[PDB]
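Q: What changes when calcium ion is included in the input?
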Amino acid sequence: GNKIHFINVQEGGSDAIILESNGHFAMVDTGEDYDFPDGSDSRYPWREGIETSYKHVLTDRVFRRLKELSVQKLDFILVTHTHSDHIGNVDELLSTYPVDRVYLKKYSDSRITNSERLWDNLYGYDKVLQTATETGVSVIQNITQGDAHFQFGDMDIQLYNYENETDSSGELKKIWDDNSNSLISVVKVNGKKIYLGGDLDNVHGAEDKYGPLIGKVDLMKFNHHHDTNKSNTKDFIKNLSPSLIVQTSDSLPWKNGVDSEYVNWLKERGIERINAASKDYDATVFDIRKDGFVNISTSYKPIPS
Ligand SMILES: C[N+](C)(C)CCOP(=O)(O)O
Ligand SMILES: [Ca+2]
Ligand SMILES: [Ca+2]
Ligand SMILES: [Fe+3]
Ligand SMILES: [Fe+3]
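A: The predicted holo structure follows.
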């Protein structure tokens, strides 16, 4: 305690984050996995853009880091949303580690208004529910007020955008993409604050709404890897006013190519920005101290090699 490990991608964008406090371990998201549905089960039909590439898989880096840390137990796994590059390794983790619970908001294909954004989502969701039932791992889907503040080693954690919002009948409210449903975590320890918002976007107003409620932080994980079209809205960055942005991506901020204007804007504001992308190390690690964040990535063994 107290450290945050952002598992590095080889290529593309994917989130797996390990929180380490005192001697406790937890995960915020789990990264993309080898498995995917092929359409042999019509519940999970093939659809175009389901991820298949081993170059985008984080499975081996996640499991190697956990083993290198002598993890015996995860106190929780928090899942931000159902996309495979976030929920992907949950059932593999549930099958390997003791886990005391999982935070997983409700999902249904029916609540996504675009058929071309269903992909893999349900397969991943249903892997969590089925595997957690087989292992007796408690799944918190109806997160009370609640529930949404709580204590993890030395870390104080506050959740946002955690409710299952319903229509009448209710039925989950319709959204354009599961990104807008992203479960947000703010972690506070040693006088520092870290925002972790999955693939939060502003398509249904979530950045406009939660920016002012979250307020000032020190370290911000970029929303949705690198996108500046529908995420990482300037009002949202100014609300959080982070000293450091970490991207779980090998790409610079991106809107029809490198958003050089946006990259320049961050430098002008004095915001440092780093990519958690590597061929040499499993994670970009910060030590979270009273004095600031120290990048201790090179203090771990490299990937063999
Ligand atoms: C689910 N997916 C991996 C096929 C699409 C990409 O997800 P996103 O990171 O752009 O929301
Ligand atoms: Ca997968
Ligand atoms: Ca899996
Ligand atoms: Fe993603
Ligand atoms: Fe996503």
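Observations recorded in class: The first helix runs from residue 59 to 68.
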